[PDB]
Amino acid sequence: TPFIRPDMKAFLEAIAAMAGPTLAEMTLEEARASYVALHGMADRPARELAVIRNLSCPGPAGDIPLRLYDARESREAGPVITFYHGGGFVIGDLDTHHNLCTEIAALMDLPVVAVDYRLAPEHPFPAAIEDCEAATRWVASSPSELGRTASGVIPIGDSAGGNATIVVSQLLGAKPADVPVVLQVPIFPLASDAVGSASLEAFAEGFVLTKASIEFFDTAYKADRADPRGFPILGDHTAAPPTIVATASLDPIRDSGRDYAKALVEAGRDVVYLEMEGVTHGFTNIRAAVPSTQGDLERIIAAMKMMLG
């Protein structure tokens, strides 16, 4: 059996005892609500911040809702973190990842702008990518409504948001925004197709993220397997920005993150590869129920500070 931390194992046992339905067996809104409750009841509370503000920016389909987080009411020009939540491009929103966002803002002492991108199945691929890209370009333009000047942007996101992180970095690499991507932080990302990977078969059931859920998300989102906006392992890595890839050792899509970090090394790019041992997919948002995952997040934070200077 693979190594599992005792506090992680207790959380897995609680999930197994619940013996709930699969995402596909729920209504779509029930699936979304189950994720709100999962993070809501497992994550640490939000940090108190000087600024937590709802706003929006123009997007190709209409306005994109955003949430700004800042430990400071006023700050000089500097990098701005642009965050994209996980949930397979089907579930999650600004609230499911709100507490994590306040934690990133507090521990980095940088502003964080989270993106409420359009979701599948209502908006299939590449809708989420369109909104993540547009919001990141908007932040990079230092708009007056943001009240903070950006010298650079830092794409960051978990799971599907880690997919969006890499895609955004690739799109902005090809057609620059007003300032560069100075660092990207894909956290347990889907970069290569997980079908056929060893991790997907090893951790198909019992590790929070399941093969069944991955399939449910894929059917709703409908990413083209040949399109680098769906599977950014296919993109051009030769000018990838400085990168931190964080994975979990018990994650069915762990090997997708391994693949991406190896491709960056193969292309000669600077990359920090951190594989958190004995925890699952989603460890960034279960920091109360599994207290050791707070330390995993702090390691990501420390690597970010180092890679930023």
Ligand SMILES: CCCCCC(=O)Oc1ccc([N+](=O)[O-])cc1
């Ligand atoms: C209830 C568990 C499902 C949500 C898991 C999650 O926290 O976020 C994910 C984001 C994207 C992908 N994916 O790209 O297959 C899988 C998982």
Ligand SMILES: CCCCCC(=O)O
């Ligand atoms: C709040 C989650 C729904 C996505 C926001 C949107 O469709 O623009």
